[PDB]
């Protein structure tokens, strides 16, 4: 089962502060250490800190500026990271990891995609993409759905609630005028569609919105 | 307050003084020798603690004559102390065994 | 003897940015290292003891990093007061040794000089001496050319120029130009002009006075 | 309060000897070490020696020639440095520093500017610099005073006994025919001067002379 749980995304205004959460199930010893790792877009992993929940002593990376402050709630088994006075350089994915106190981080968190911008939260616009009546097909048929006009990253796109997975490409978002835009494609045998229902599931954690749209042929 | 318990306490008290003086003297002896590591008081203190317990870490050891003489004094004092505790402990157990058999 | 190496020598940075001075030891020294700040004419000031530990009174902008051989001194939001030489000093083995040093420089916006001409004092004239002093204050960059003219004719002899290191108040530079003449030479001439040619203005910024 | 005190300047003839002093107040432990550091004009710091006053054992930098010999007076809490057979290479600022025996030098001295030359000591000539009647002003007015014809370095220049500090440039001295020359400028709001008194304070420690001169407008 999934051990560590983090919020998907967090939007912060430049200069403002944010607390990040990380709860844990399974085996939760007294000797356990919860770390936090920073990863900028297209960059490597960067260790920021660590905290032992049972005592509350925290250690921080002194190589980079100490922006964070670590605290932990004992009863809920949740670790927290208080980050303040954030710039554009703070816009990154933040992971939390369980370390048994023996070096390696065995189980990792999903990651919190933090974006530092003055813009407001925008829910996505999901539109289906069915093949035109002029175009033909063979053994396989490729379908899709468009995701546009949302802020900030990311969005989770699955097909038939994740049950359909083989032959799916989710293209990276493009930013234009404070709004992202991406697409996802699915390739199924020509026989299946649309006699068998196909639906892409789009989740936007920043606006806390999840929308579904079934792919149907053009008129 | 028997002799062996008085002597052990005296040895322990004495040892701490030997440690403190030993740290202070090490620094005064080592400084001047090029490459000497025992040149700061807090460092020499924990050196003394290690040396008194007959423990050596890497090349954390005096290079000068007097520094090594201090080391000898620290070592001897260390062993004498932890030998005197054993002796004091032994005296206590043998005394009770005498009471155990009604002797 | 531990050799400490501070690279680079001169370090230039934007105002409000983060900066980092590196100091490398010839061999492993643990954390036995200390940082010192020294401004112009002033004495060395302790910044960070034992690699990372901070001294009270020292700004929270200063923080130390590193162990072994690689050591780093870092400043967040670099301001005018930080312009100084920076020295690392080890205490691992006898004898204690210093680094060559690293000078901090702040690249600011361009500034025009504040030109001020001054006639020689009557007290100097009493002793029979004459000196026309012309200041060029708070300009950026430091590169500036000063021209002296007597009655419209250029003068080169007797001119002594002194430049200041980047000012710890506003991150600017200042020059002083001194034209030294004998009282007799001063008495036989009318007007004295001090010209300043800088990057900010295509036209020479001039100041002039007449002895009359 | 100022812990360590050194004479400002010392003039020495080439080949002759000089003793430098360094008294200390505040906390003066038995474990304390007084060091001495050499700094040539436009050069880095150079450790020369150290001495524990309570025992009188001294250690010297063997990398450079042992020119110095360290002694200390117990009752006065003053450390001394005996330097002999000095060349032009010995012309430098000499600092004394307090080291608690734990590596770093916490508090430093002012420094003794030692100059090795055959020339005689010359007191400075201070002349005021007021704006010419032809030149105009705006919100700010810049004043100054000239220091010339003195030997050797340095000179301490303050304005209104150091009370006025913001906007003051003291330009480095220039050497010409065995005599130094420098200037200092002050920028005050046009309203203040001369309705409020402005005076530069020049101190020359080598001749033990201190002179003041108030800035007044031209006739
Ligand atoms: Na052993
Ligand atoms: Na060993």
XYZ file of C-alpha atoms and ligand atoms in Angstrom:
755
model
C 0.000 0.000 0.000
C 0.949 3.677 -0.508
C 2.921 4.702 2.580
C 3.455 8.474 2.281
C 0.811 10.999 1.209
C 1.367 14.551 -0.059
C -0.937 17.197 -1.559
C -0.608 17.287 -5.357
C -0.013 21.007 -5.875
C 0.362 24.231 -3.889
C 0.029 27.756 -5.291
C 1.969 30.532 -3.547
C 2.280 34.273 -4.207
C 5.841 35.701 -4.418
C 6.995 36.599 -0.897
C 4.275 34.569 0.843
C 4.661 31.404 2.953
C 3.390 27.802 2.690
C 3.213 24.688 4.893
C 3.580 21.284 3.206
C 2.174 18.070 4.694
C 3.315 14.424 4.660
C 1.368 11.713 6.528
C 2.553 8.098 6.812
C 0.948 4.696 7.441
C 2.390 1.155 7.623
C 5.382 0.655 9.916
C 6.021 3.908 11.803
C 8.886 3.398 14.274
C 10.236 5.902 16.802
C 13.608 5.711 15.005
C 12.118 6.874 11.679
C 13.330 10.004 9.869
C 11.238 12.070 7.461
C 13.334 13.922 4.879
C 12.405 16.512 2.242
C 13.842 16.694 -1.286
C 13.699 19.579 -3.787
C 13.564 19.015 -7.551
C 13.407 21.940 -9.981
C 12.032 21.385 -13.527
C 14.706 19.519 -15.511
C 17.073 19.462 -12.529
C 18.499 16.845 -10.158
C 17.381 15.951 -6.641
C 18.332 18.283 -3.784
C 18.232 17.332 -0.098
C 16.737 20.094 2.063
C 16.190 18.568 5.501
C 15.239 15.774 7.893
C 13.226 15.389 11.104
C 12.626 12.673 13.687
C 8.893 12.931 14.588
C 9.232 11.299 18.024
C 11.548 14.049 19.314
C 11.076 16.920 16.864
C 14.760 17.650 16.234
C 15.290 18.846 12.663
C 18.359 19.285 10.453
C 18.621 21.582 7.430
C 20.786 21.963 4.325
C 23.107 24.864 5.114
C 24.563 24.930 1.572
C 21.381 26.587 0.291
C 19.412 29.223 2.231
C 17.403 27.900 5.187
C 13.932 28.791 3.858
C 12.247 25.803 5.514
C 11.414 24.893 9.115
C 10.386 21.339 10.017
C 7.698 20.333 12.527
C 5.739 17.110 13.131
C 2.425 16.092 14.705
C 2.804 12.873 16.705
C -0.824 11.686 16.886
C -1.509 12.009 13.138
C 1.905 10.672 11.989
C 2.254 13.739 9.744
C 5.411 15.743 9.000
C 5.333 19.405 7.975
C 7.584 21.823 6.082
C 7.172 25.568 6.674
C 8.623 27.526 3.734
C 8.573 31.345 3.779
C 9.602 34.304 1.565
C 9.482 32.326 -1.686
C 10.888 33.451 -5.038
C 10.635 31.985 -8.557
C 13.639 29.812 -7.619
C 11.422 28.020 -5.075
C 9.029 26.787 -7.785
C 9.734 23.040 -7.635
C 8.430 19.552 -6.815
C 8.932 18.733 -3.129
C 9.167 15.097 -2.011
C 9.032 13.599 1.471
C 10.758 10.268 2.125
C 10.940 7.668 4.892
C 14.432 6.791 6.093
C 14.806 4.029 8.696
C 17.912 5.855 9.933
C 20.135 3.655 7.792
C 20.944 6.009 4.917
C 18.644 5.110 2.032
C 15.140 6.482 1.516
C 13.071 3.316 1.048
C 9.629 4.783 0.320
C 8.966 8.171 -1.306
C 6.003 10.553 -1.537
C 4.068 11.639 -4.632
C 5.524 15.154 -4.541
C 3.996 18.604 -4.146
C 4.250 20.746 -7.281
C 4.725 24.217 -5.812
C 4.376 27.173 -8.183
C 5.365 30.695 -7.115
C 3.341 33.234 -9.130
C 0.908 36.124 -8.615
C -1.735 34.650 -10.969
C -5.016 33.043 -9.838
C -6.064 29.372 -9.892
C -7.812 28.298 -13.098
C -9.772 25.042 -13.596
C -9.008 23.121 -16.843
C -11.129 22.964 -20.014
C -11.500 19.364 -21.205
C -12.573 18.755 -24.803
C -12.747 15.334 -26.513
C -10.962 14.518 -29.778
C -12.683 12.091 -32.159
C -11.422 11.177 -35.666
C -12.929 13.153 -38.560
C -15.448 11.404 -40.824
C -13.034 11.850 -43.761
C -10.159 9.914 -42.139
C -10.009 6.096 -42.222
C -8.598 3.438 -39.863
C -6.943 -0.014 -39.828
C -6.329 -2.505 -36.981
C -5.757 0.266 -34.415
C -7.612 3.529 -33.752
C -6.048 6.504 -31.945
C -8.227 8.804 -29.820
C -7.628 11.654 -27.355
C -8.789 14.619 -25.278
C -7.497 18.191 -24.950
C -6.713 19.899 -21.645
C -6.329 23.688 -21.851
C -6.609 26.953 -19.900
C -5.461 25.956 -16.417
C -3.052 27.236 -13.769
C -0.877 25.933 -12.314
C 0.688 22.504 -12.937
C 0.042 19.616 -12.793
C -2.889 17.554 -14.106
C -3.452 13.798 -13.767
C -4.826 12.179 -16.922
C -5.917 8.529 -17.005
C -8.093 6.488 -19.375
C -11.174 4.605 -18.147
C -10.093 5.530 -14.595
C -6.579 4.149 -15.167
C -7.775 0.674 -16.196
C -6.692 1.436 -19.762
C -2.951 2.115 -19.820
C -1.166 0.321 -22.680
C -0.510 2.754 -25.557
C -1.140 6.087 -23.821
C 0.920 9.259 -24.320
C 0.347 12.280 -22.082
C 2.173 15.209 -23.694
C 3.891 17.888 -21.542
C 2.025 21.167 -21.000
C 2.849 24.410 -22.824
C 2.604 27.771 -21.052
C 1.009 30.710 -22.871
C -0.318 33.871 -21.170
C -0.460 32.465 -17.599
C -2.323 29.308 -18.727
C -1.116 25.756 -19.441
C -2.243 23.434 -22.261
C -1.651 19.711 -22.883
C -3.066 16.641 -24.639
C -3.285 12.886 -24.027
C -3.683 10.124 -26.616
C -4.937 6.525 -26.449
C -4.543 3.722 -29.013
C -7.095 0.893 -28.933
C -7.975 -1.917 -31.385
C -10.422 -0.613 -34.013
C -12.991 -3.273 -33.041
C -13.393 -2.056 -29.442
C -14.325 1.602 -30.028
C -16.925 2.945 -29.574
C -18.867 -0.277 -28.865
C -16.854 -0.270 -25.633
C -16.805 2.982 -23.632
C -13.607 5.076 -23.561
C -13.210 7.999 -21.136
C -10.265 10.181 -20.075
C -10.120 11.225 -16.419
C -8.576 14.639 -15.736
C -7.733 15.759 -12.187
C -6.618 19.259 -11.180
C -5.524 19.255 -7.492
C -4.907 23.022 -7.298
C -8.583 23.811 -7.949
C -9.623 20.474 -6.368
C -11.527 19.540 -9.534
C -11.920 16.194 -11.304
C -13.805 15.868 -14.600
C -14.618 12.959 -16.931
C -15.473 12.985 -20.645
C -16.453 9.980 -22.792
C -15.098 9.868 -26.350
C -17.912 9.634 -28.918
C -17.703 9.725 -32.757
C -18.465 12.924 -34.699
C -22.257 13.187 -35.219
C 33.143 5.742 54.492
C 35.755 2.974 54.142
C 39.298 3.416 52.773
C 38.668 1.866 49.344
C 35.596 4.053 48.795
C 37.515 7.126 49.982
C 40.460 6.252 47.728
C 38.269 5.646 44.652
C 36.545 9.022 45.094
C 39.960 10.633 45.592
C 41.241 8.891 42.439
C 38.210 10.027 40.421
C 38.536 13.604 41.713
C 42.286 13.491 41.006
C 41.740 12.083 37.494
C 39.504 15.018 36.501
C 42.250 17.430 37.618
C 44.835 15.377 35.685
C 42.530 15.539 32.651
C 42.047 19.326 32.872
C 45.725 20.033 33.557
C 46.556 17.476 30.849
C 44.482 19.311 28.249
C 46.014 22.654 29.226
C 49.592 21.328 29.237
C 49.216 19.478 25.919
C 48.308 22.720 24.110
C 51.221 24.603 25.719
C 53.637 21.839 24.711
C 52.367 21.141 21.184
C 52.083 24.700 19.808
C 55.372 25.470 18.076
C 55.746 22.043 16.480
C 54.769 22.208 12.785
C 51.793 19.961 11.992
C 50.768 19.504 15.645
C 47.058 18.756 16.090
C 46.678 19.166 19.868
C 46.791 22.973 19.659
C 43.307 23.893 20.960
C 41.985 23.402 24.516
C 38.625 21.708 23.727
C 40.335 19.308 21.307
C 43.031 18.437 23.862
C 40.318 17.841 26.469
C 38.653 15.045 24.497
C 42.103 13.774 23.518
C 42.830 13.444 27.236
C 39.541 11.600 27.843
C 40.390 9.163 25.047
C 43.992 8.801 26.251
C 42.940 8.273 29.888
C 40.622 5.483 28.736
C 43.530 3.998 26.708
C 41.857 4.852 23.391
C 43.645 6.405 20.416
C 41.902 7.821 17.354
C 43.922 7.897 14.117
C 46.840 10.313 14.361
C 45.310 12.356 17.206
C 48.430 12.036 19.359
C 51.140 14.404 20.672
C 54.377 14.865 18.716
C 56.510 16.722 21.288
C 58.493 15.181 24.163
C 56.670 17.002 26.980
C 53.374 16.469 25.142
C 54.109 12.752 25.131
C 55.183 12.986 28.783
C 51.809 14.574 29.543
C 50.271 11.660 27.624
C 52.145 9.217 29.876
C 50.898 11.025 33.003
C 47.339 11.034 31.592
C 47.526 7.315 30.717
C 48.980 6.215 34.075
C 46.426 8.324 35.979
C 43.688 6.821 33.793
C 44.693 3.202 34.392
C 45.397 3.805 38.103
C 41.885 5.236 38.527
C 40.010 2.474 36.681
C 42.242 -0.071 38.414
C 41.471 1.428 41.819
C 37.710 1.233 41.188
C 38.036 -2.497 40.428
C 40.102 -2.959 43.600
C 37.468 -1.040 45.584
C 34.699 -3.130 43.991
C 36.572 -6.353 44.786
C 36.979 -5.328 48.441
C 33.230 -4.718 48.691
C 32.291 -8.122 47.246
C 34.804 -10.103 49.344
C 33.539 -8.283 52.455
C 29.950 -9.351 51.751
C 30.995 -12.942 50.976
C 32.576 -12.982 54.444
C 29.160 -11.917 55.792
C 27.444 -14.471 53.515
C 29.167 -17.448 55.184
C 28.917 -15.898 58.667
C 32.702 -15.564 58.802
C 51.631 24.049 7.254
C 48.137 24.002 5.727
C 47.861 25.871 2.430
C 44.548 27.681 1.963
C 43.424 28.696 -1.532
C 40.671 31.257 -2.139
C 39.284 31.194 -5.684
C 38.458 33.452 -7.359
C 40.392 36.551 -6.247
C 37.848 39.245 -7.180
C 34.131 38.475 -7.058
C 31.492 40.713 -8.666
C 27.753 40.368 -7.985
C 24.372 42.095 -8.434
C 22.766 43.902 -5.451
C 20.282 41.797 -3.474
C 21.639 38.533 -4.898
C 23.210 35.545 -3.146
C 27.017 35.244 -3.233
C 29.514 32.481 -2.333
C 33.245 32.629 -1.499
C 35.134 29.328 -1.676
C 38.209 28.411 0.370
C 40.062 25.149 -0.224
C 42.595 23.621 2.166
C 45.661 21.630 1.063
C 44.454 18.666 3.145
C 41.416 17.578 5.193
C 40.873 19.896 8.178
C 37.367 18.863 9.311
C 35.499 22.027 10.303
C 38.450 23.871 11.857
C 38.113 27.051 9.795
C 37.085 30.668 10.427
C 35.965 33.572 8.222
C 36.953 37.241 8.602
C 35.639 40.445 7.001
C 37.963 43.401 6.431
C 36.875 46.682 4.830
C 39.116 49.551 3.649
C 41.520 50.849 6.351
C 39.683 48.781 8.990
C 40.836 45.780 11.020
C 39.696 42.136 10.466
C 36.284 41.173 11.869
C 35.201 37.621 12.726
C 32.176 36.408 10.749
C 31.779 32.631 11.048
C 33.639 30.377 13.500
C 34.092 26.610 13.004
C 32.791 26.393 9.404
C 29.102 27.145 10.109
C 28.678 28.507 13.665
C 27.641 32.178 13.707
C 28.872 35.000 15.945
C 26.314 37.241 17.665
C 26.232 40.786 16.267
C 26.899 39.397 12.779
C 24.019 39.781 10.248
C 21.774 36.742 9.654
C 22.606 37.105 5.944
C 26.000 35.507 6.610
C 26.136 31.702 6.772
C 28.968 29.176 6.495
C 29.023 25.846 4.655
C 31.374 22.910 4.062
C 33.628 20.275 5.623
C 36.903 18.519 4.740
C 38.637 20.691 2.131
C 35.766 22.520 0.426
C 34.439 25.463 2.441
C 32.008 28.226 1.487
C 30.961 31.601 2.901
C 27.588 32.830 1.654
C 25.656 36.105 1.805
C 21.957 36.453 0.973
C 20.876 39.875 -0.323
C 24.302 41.483 -0.781
C 24.266 45.171 0.172
C 26.732 48.095 0.122
C 28.081 47.367 3.626
C 29.372 43.963 2.454
C 32.013 45.376 0.069
C 35.236 44.107 1.656
C 38.055 41.575 1.575
C 37.173 38.157 2.975
C 39.670 35.820 4.637
C 39.507 32.156 5.644
C 41.729 30.943 8.492
C 42.415 27.355 9.577
C 43.163 26.054 13.071
C 43.596 22.318 12.447
C 47.394 22.098 12.655
C 50.186 24.400 13.822
C 50.873 26.986 12.604
C 47.664 28.891 11.853
C 47.384 30.033 8.232
C 45.278 32.495 6.235
C 43.884 32.494 2.712
C 45.023 34.908 0.006
C 41.664 36.685 0.288
C 38.595 37.393 -1.832
C 37.391 40.920 -2.612
C 33.648 41.480 -2.983
C 32.391 43.947 -5.585
C 28.839 45.128 -6.294
C 27.715 45.833 -9.865
C 25.133 48.618 -9.566
C 23.378 51.017 -11.961
C 25.442 53.737 -13.678
C 25.948 56.993 -11.764
C 27.107 60.489 -12.733
C 29.881 62.123 -10.636
C 29.275 65.008 -8.223
C 31.904 67.510 -9.383
C 33.067 70.195 -6.936
C 35.938 72.634 -7.512
C 37.776 74.325 -4.624
C 40.169 77.315 -4.706
C 43.322 77.214 -2.542
C 42.852 78.574 0.985
C 44.310 81.930 2.055
C 46.042 79.989 4.859
C 47.943 77.993 2.232
C 48.700 81.263 0.423
C 50.101 82.684 3.691
C 52.715 79.902 3.646
C 53.170 80.563 -0.095
C 51.460 77.440 -1.445
C 48.574 76.912 -3.869
C 46.412 73.874 -4.627
C 43.148 73.626 -6.551
C 41.181 70.588 -5.368
C 38.465 69.008 -7.509
C 36.301 66.127 -6.286
C 34.413 63.577 -8.356
C 32.013 61.855 -5.958
C 29.668 58.863 -6.224
C 30.084 57.766 -9.852
C 29.760 54.377 -11.550
C 31.690 52.784 -13.163
C 35.094 53.740 -11.685
C 36.560 54.598 -15.110
C 36.732 58.382 -15.465
C 39.077 60.937 -17.058
C 39.917 64.281 -15.449
C 41.153 67.266 -17.480
C 42.703 70.475 -16.131
C 42.636 73.796 -17.992
C 44.186 77.146 -17.064
C 42.684 80.114 -18.957
C 41.477 77.644 -21.613
C 44.853 75.908 -22.009
C 45.343 72.302 -20.844
C 47.637 71.544 -17.887
C 49.292 68.212 -17.015
C 52.151 69.014 -14.607
C 51.440 69.071 -10.861
C 48.279 66.964 -11.225
C 47.936 64.206 -8.611
C 44.986 61.800 -8.714
C 43.679 59.472 -6.002
C 40.916 56.888 -6.445
C 38.796 55.181 -3.789
C 37.810 51.525 -3.553
C 34.092 50.826 -4.012
C 32.201 52.763 -1.331
C 30.562 50.709 1.432
C 27.719 53.256 1.646
C 26.302 53.205 -1.907
C 28.577 50.853 -3.926
C 30.064 53.760 -5.919
C 33.515 55.232 -6.593
C 35.126 58.624 -5.975
C 38.213 60.419 -7.321
C 40.184 63.410 -6.031
C 42.262 65.556 -8.384
C 44.879 67.927 -6.977
C 46.602 70.579 -9.090
C 49.630 71.831 -7.149
C 51.217 75.133 -8.193
C 53.528 77.685 -6.571
C 51.917 80.875 -5.216
C 53.732 82.865 -7.938
C 52.326 80.596 -10.679
C 48.820 80.924 -9.204
C 49.024 84.734 -9.006
C 49.785 85.171 -12.730
C 46.725 83.238 -13.968
C 43.002 84.040 -13.988
C 40.680 81.034 -14.440
C 41.016 77.365 -13.464
C 38.751 74.621 -14.835
C 38.231 70.985 -13.806
C 36.716 68.777 -16.521
C 35.198 65.324 -16.007
C 34.612 62.773 -18.779
C 32.427 59.806 -17.813
C 30.397 56.976 -19.398
C 27.085 58.532 -18.259
C 27.411 61.766 -20.269
C 28.872 62.452 -23.725
C 29.467 66.095 -22.759
C 32.287 66.873 -20.279
C 30.981 67.898 -16.844
C 32.986 71.015 -15.961
C 33.552 73.276 -12.951
C 35.434 76.575 -13.186
C 36.483 79.464 -10.949
C 38.291 82.763 -11.548
C 40.948 84.071 -9.143
C 39.389 87.563 -9.305
C 34.151 48.349 24.670
C 37.466 48.350 22.749
C 39.460 45.390 24.069
C 42.930 45.675 22.494
C 44.946 48.891 22.164
C 47.891 49.561 19.838
C 49.884 52.692 18.954
C 48.729 54.140 15.622
C 52.079 54.463 13.852
C 55.778 53.762 14.402
C 58.648 55.267 12.402
C 61.855 53.230 12.126
C 65.176 53.870 10.369
C 66.482 51.079 8.073
C 68.491 48.618 10.182
C 67.123 49.880 13.510
C 64.826 48.067 15.971
C 61.326 48.711 17.386
C 59.104 47.357 20.181
C 55.338 47.244 19.570
C 52.778 47.275 22.393
C 49.330 45.694 22.848
C 47.365 46.109 26.103
C 44.050 44.350 26.793
C 41.031 44.914 29.051
C 37.754 42.988 29.511
C 38.053 39.246 30.112
C 41.749 38.363 30.447
C 42.097 34.649 31.258
C 45.300 32.729 31.995
C 44.556 30.559 28.934
C 44.556 33.562 26.565
C 46.929 33.834 23.592
C 48.079 37.096 22.018
C 48.999 36.734 18.343
C 50.577 39.167 15.870
C 49.605 39.537 12.201
C 51.511 41.268 9.379
C 49.746 43.001 6.483
C 51.713 44.719 3.714
C 50.018 47.440 1.595
C 47.626 45.692 -0.810
C 48.565 42.257 0.538
C 46.878 39.503 2.558
C 47.176 38.742 6.266
C 50.321 36.996 7.516
C 50.628 35.257 10.889
C 53.934 36.039 12.619
C 53.614 34.709 16.165
C 51.750 34.001 19.398
C 52.421 34.247 23.140
C 50.696 33.156 26.341
C 51.208 36.061 28.814
C 50.792 33.939 31.962
C 53.829 31.775 31.135
C 55.738 33.769 28.518
C 56.248 30.946 26.013
C 56.213 32.297 22.458
C 55.927 30.682 19.023
C 57.110 32.199 15.738
C 56.470 31.772 12.013
C 59.486 29.855 10.726
C 58.400 30.196 7.069
C 59.523 33.836 7.071
C 62.634 35.114 8.881
C 62.338 35.317 12.675
C 62.720 39.107 12.994
C 60.426 39.343 16.026
C 60.738 38.292 19.670
C 57.668 38.202 21.921
C 57.519 39.254 25.583
C 54.657 40.169 27.941
C 54.186 42.192 31.132
C 51.802 40.427 33.520
C 50.713 43.329 35.754
C 49.786 45.681 32.886
C 48.172 42.992 30.667
C 50.339 44.206 27.768
C 52.011 42.106 25.062
C 55.135 43.237 23.212
C 56.817 42.520 19.872
C 60.546 43.225 19.500
C 61.445 43.607 15.808
C 65.069 44.255 14.787
C 67.147 44.843 11.617
C 64.214 46.098 9.539
C 64.189 46.570 5.765
C 61.651 48.147 3.384
C 59.926 44.733 3.330
C 59.050 45.229 7.016
C 56.981 48.353 6.272
C 53.494 47.054 7.118
C 50.457 47.254 9.415
C 50.893 45.009 12.462
C 47.824 43.701 14.306
C 47.548 41.995 17.682
C 44.627 39.641 18.337
C 43.077 37.802 21.280
C 42.666 34.054 20.841
C 40.910 32.094 23.602
C 43.064 29.110 22.613
C 40.300 27.773 20.390
C 41.590 28.754 16.949
C 39.780 31.929 15.921
C 40.882 35.458 16.793
C 37.722 36.965 18.299
C 38.845 40.550 18.939
C 41.509 42.423 16.950
C 43.663 45.514 17.512
C 43.663 48.790 15.570
C 47.024 48.049 13.948
C 50.403 49.773 14.034
C 51.402 51.322 10.705
C 55.167 50.808 10.710
C 57.181 52.673 8.074
C 60.866 51.899 7.485
C 62.591 55.001 6.071
C 65.472 57.373 6.851
C 63.291 60.515 6.591
C 62.119 62.613 9.565
C 58.625 62.955 11.066
C 56.548 65.764 9.555
C 53.295 67.174 11.009
C 50.422 67.663 8.494
C 49.221 70.933 6.931
C 45.427 71.208 7.142
C 43.666 73.680 4.850
C 39.873 74.047 4.485
C 38.046 73.830 1.149
C 34.961 76.020 0.693
C 32.959 76.356 -2.563
C 33.868 79.312 -4.797
C 31.457 82.260 -4.964
C 30.934 81.548 -8.689
C 29.657 77.977 -8.181
C 26.023 77.258 -7.240
C 24.294 74.518 -5.211
C 21.055 72.487 -5.001
C 19.638 70.250 -2.231
C 23.100 69.040 -1.164
C 26.386 70.898 -0.646
C 29.800 69.196 -0.744
C 32.653 70.518 1.416
C 36.157 69.342 2.363
C 39.630 69.903 3.804
C 43.122 69.207 2.441
C 45.822 67.301 4.320
C 49.338 67.678 2.890
C 53.060 67.574 3.717
C 53.266 64.825 6.334
C 55.359 61.724 7.006
C 54.620 58.945 7.533
C 51.187 57.295 7.234
C 48.501 57.323 8.483
C 46.102 60.149 9.392
C 42.660 59.874 11.008
C 40.087 62.243 9.514
C 36.603 62.639 11.005
C 33.883 65.286 10.668
C 32.484 67.121 13.704
C 34.528 64.714 15.866
C 33.061 61.669 14.089
C 29.433 62.614 14.798
C 28.993 63.407 11.103
C 29.643 60.267 9.060
C 27.025 59.706 6.337
C 28.387 60.834 2.946
C 32.100 61.144 3.744
C 34.949 60.085 1.439
C 38.532 60.067 2.714
C 40.785 59.677 -0.332
C 44.032 57.634 -0.136
C 47.295 59.560 0.284
C 49.768 60.197 -2.545
C 53.522 60.158 -1.911
C 55.693 62.861 -3.483
C 59.227 63.770 -2.329
C 59.066 62.046 1.098
C 55.700 63.672 1.956
C 52.119 62.357 1.789
C 48.994 64.243 0.653
C 45.277 63.397 0.907
C 41.791 64.930 1.003
C 38.442 64.230 2.680
C 34.981 65.300 1.508
C 31.627 65.734 3.271
C 28.142 66.092 1.750
C 25.477 67.829 3.848
C 22.012 69.252 3.036
C 22.367 72.801 1.667
C 20.153 74.175 4.465
C 22.478 73.095 7.297
C 25.736 74.776 6.224
C 27.134 77.068 7.472
C 24.308 77.921 9.910
C 25.386 74.693 11.617
C 29.114 74.275 12.330
C 31.140 71.784 10.255
C 34.698 70.815 11.246
C 37.128 68.111 10.087
C 39.312 66.498 12.753
C 42.772 65.394 11.608
C 44.998 63.230 13.826
C 48.644 62.369 13.131
C 49.854 59.738 15.663
C 53.482 59.726 14.459
C 53.987 63.371 15.467
C 51.345 63.019 18.225
C 49.412 65.970 16.783
C 45.669 66.569 16.453
C 44.268 69.661 14.721
C 40.751 70.955 14.004
C 39.553 73.391 11.330
C 36.005 74.731 10.874
C 34.744 75.139 7.302
C 33.663 78.730 6.596
C 32.494 80.303 3.287
C 34.876 82.375 1.138
C 34.927 85.976 2.459
Na 42.523 0.186 24.272
Na 43.164 3.188 17.460
